[PDB]
């Protein structure tokens, strides 16, 4: 019941960071590393992991002992961590971007380049296809197919607001959009390129910008 | 050739699911025995391991006494299909493009940032696949086409007898368009931004709309 | 600056294509001579190399009898345009955003995961570029805008005399919309989800549809 409130609380607690991986060489036994940097070094070479705010002044301080370095970096002032994928009972392909507090059901499939925002829920056996986007709290049922490039609009604030809810066995075409708070009924089909602005009854096909009922199917 | 779609499904059935990790660690490593299943680049002090999580996890547990600290880097979970080795291809592929094995990239093609090429996709000579575009399984693009940003060319892996999307030479497709399964877009045709193409496009015609219709013949 | 578009094209023509690799290797490395074209971090046993594949590939072959094993990491092929250093920017850029050099990101802008910013793109102060959105070459967004997930703002690199997409302040654009080349969206306008904007949008109007039309004055 308090999920949406606890998401906003988690976000407000999250600490902005600019995490870097540094490879370096030099007279590293002469170097003094602070507790703030995770360091993996021998006397000759090393690998450092840490926030740029700690690493930058560190490199400046030891410039005379460090011969050369490379800094790798992916993000800036980013607070929300990404989800640990290593133990999930599902399939997540490389280039998928999944934030913390996302729920991925058993034997779901998250394709290359899909993006799952905080609070997103993916039911068991569901495919989120390539480049698809699940906004904050967007909720997908079981054995659904969310087409390549489709956007399910996000709803973080206000926490009392209903997120997008995709019921079971839904197929949504490529590059469609489902707007905030819209419910797509069980077994329904949303055509490629549709913009779904109101609830879709179970077992109907909708299509168009904006989507209209085009057909009622018998399963 | 004629067996290509069959050979794709066979390659996928043969692919082994893996949770590849990169581990940076330190400790008493001369006292550590690494198993055959892990690639390891170490001194007696620090080191880097590449392996499947199913091997690396029980390893890290088995050697907890000797391992002082570690970091695990991971991108994918239970992913079976390898990505394409880009290094020797006679084309341009920008960072963030996600390209699976068994994709065919013609001479002097350009694959922009964030484009996603699924297994079996074919990109002809001189073609640009623009930012965030998606080529589904077996989607075939001719020579000197421009596939606009965010465009989805629908995938057809199964059944193998099904025709894929075929884009003929010199076609330009607008941003965030969709071409549905098995559709042929004729030579020199133009597809407007945001169109959903549901049936074959004649050569040298412009189509537009959701669903797309013929809007003018080009001379 | 009046020269901006010309200078972007100059910068591209000057960028050198590269196939950058990171190589982890092990072997008898004290016996190896690493050329000055490769950045090298090694002890006698193991090392890390950074360099262009054109230099690293014949180096690996020349030294195969000394190198026991290696792993090559690579991201790109024949890529010339560098990416933007994010580290000192006064803004928020999330992981997986792809942002080229000569992109301007204003104070407390937000660049969400998977957004794509091409060379010349300008993002104004307090503007959000949402997940999966694409700013084409020279696309210009004002202050306190919201560019919705999956939206494409069309690019204009050549000809340099052509106007880019210009989004004025306080604009909201819905998900998976498209703004075509040279189109100006007026202050405080709303573009509906899925719209294709083919012509200028008046300030404080709502436009919708494929092609977009005025549906409301706000
Ligand atoms: Cl797959
Ligand atoms: Cl969101
Ligand atoms: Cl380019
Ligand atoms: Cl596909
Ligand atoms: Cl955020
Ligand atoms: Cl562009
Ligand atoms: Mg997209």
Swiss-Prot record, chain A:
Establish whether keyword Ubl conjugation is in the entry: no
The pathway entry for this protein reads as:
Amino-acid biosynthesis; L-lysine biosynthesis via DAP pathway; LL-2,6-diaminopimelate from (S)-tetrahydrodipicolinate (acetylase route): step 1/3
What this protein catalyses is:
(S)-2,3,4,5-tetrahydrodipicolinate + acetyl-CoA + H2O = L-2-acetamido-6-oxoheptanedioate + CoA
PROSITE patterns given for it?
A: HEXAPEP_TRANSFERASES (PS00101)
Identify the Pfam families for this entry.
Answer: DapH_N, Hexapep, Hexapep_2
Q: Which terms are listed as keywords in the entry?
A: Acyltransferase, Amino-acid biosynthesis, Diaminopimelate biosynthesis, Lysine biosynthesis, Repeat, Transferase
The record ties this protein, via Gene3D superfamilies, to:
Hexapeptide repeat proteins (2.160.10.10), Malonyl-CoA ACP transacylase, ACP-binding (3.30.70.250)
For this protein, what is the EC number? 2.3.1.89
Name the domain of life.
Bacteria
If you read the UniProt record, what top EC class would you report for this enzyme, in one word?
transferase
InterPro entries cross-referenced by the UniProt entry: DapH, DapH_N, Hexapep, Hexapep_transf_CS, Trans_hexapeptide_repeat, Trimer_LpxA-like_sf
The task this protein performs is described as: Catalyzes the transfer of an acetyl group from acetyl-CoA to tetrahydrodipicolinate.
**Annotated protein name in UniProt:** 2,3,4,5-tetrahydropyridine-2,6-dicarboxylate N-acetyltransferase
Give the classification, highest ranks: Bacteria, Bacillati, Bacillota, Bacilli, Lactobacillales
Curated annotation (Swiss-Prot), chain C:
The entry lists its GO molecular-function terms as: tetrahydrodipicolinate N-acetyltransferase activity
E.C. numbers: 2.3.1.89
Record-linked InterPro entries: DapH, DapH_N, Hexapep, Hexapep_transf_CS, Trans_hexapeptide_repeat, Trimer_LpxA-like_sf
* UniProt KW keywords: Acyltransferase, Amino-acid biosynthesis, Diaminopimelate biosynthesis, Lysine biosynthesis, Repeat, Transferase
Which GO BP annotation is one of this protein's?
A: lysine biosynthetic process via diaminopimelate
Gene3D superfamilies reported in the protein's UniProt record: Hexapeptide repeat proteins (2.160.10.10), Malonyl-CoA ACP transacylase, ACP-binding (3.30.70.250)
Q: Which reaction does it catalyse?
A: (S)-2,3,4,5-tetrahydrodipicolinate + acetyl-CoA + H2O = L-2-acetamido-6-oxoheptanedioate + CoA
Top EC class per UniProt?
A: transferase
Pathway assignment reads:
Amino-acid biosynthesis; L-lysine biosynthesis via DAP pathway; LL-2,6-diaminopimelate from (S)-tetrahydrodipicolinate (acetylase route): step 1/3
PROSITE patterns recorded: HEXAPEP_TRANSFERASES
Superkingdom of source: Bacteria
Q: Using the chain's own numbering, where are the disulfide bonds? A: none
Biological function: Catalyzes the transfer of an acetyl group from acetyl-CoA to tetrahydrodipicolinate.
| Entry's family note | Belongs to the transferase hexapeptide repeat family. DapH subfamily.
What HAMAP family does the entry give?
DapH (MF_01691)
Listed name of the protein: 2,3,4,5-tetrahydropyridine-2,6-dicarboxylate N-acetyltransferase
Q: Which organism is it from?
A: Enterococcus faecalis (strain ATCC 700802 / V583)
Designated gene of the protein: dapH
């Amino acid at each position: 019941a308090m999920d949406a409130y606890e998401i906003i609380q988690y976000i407000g607690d999250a600490k902005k960071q600019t995490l870097v991986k540094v490879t370096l060489k030099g007279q590293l036994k002469e170097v003094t590393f602070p507790e703030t940097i995770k360091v993996f070094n021998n006397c000759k070479t090393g690998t450092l992991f840490g926030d740029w705010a700690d690493v930058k002044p560190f490199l400046e301080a030891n410039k005379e002992k460090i011969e050369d370095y490379v800094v790798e970096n992916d993000a800036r002032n980013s607070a929300i961590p990404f989800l640990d994928l290593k133990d999930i009972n599902a399939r997540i392909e490389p280039g998928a971007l999944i934030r913390e507090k996302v729920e991925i059901g058993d034997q779901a499939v998250i394709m290359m380049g899909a993006i799952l925002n905080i609070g997103a829920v993916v039911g068991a056996g569901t495919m989120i296809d390539m480049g698809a986007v699940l906004g904050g709290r967007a909720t997908v049922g079981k054995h659904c197919h969310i087409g390549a490039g489709t956007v399910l609009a996000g709803v973080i604030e206000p926490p009392s607001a209903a997120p997008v809810v995709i019921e079971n066995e839904v197929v949504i075409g490529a590059n469609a959009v489902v707007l905030e708070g819209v419910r797509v009924g069980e077994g329904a089909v949303v055509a490629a390129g549709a913009v779904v602005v109101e609830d879709v009854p179970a077992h109907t096909v909708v299509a168009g910008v904006p989507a209209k009922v085009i057909k009622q199917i018998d399963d």
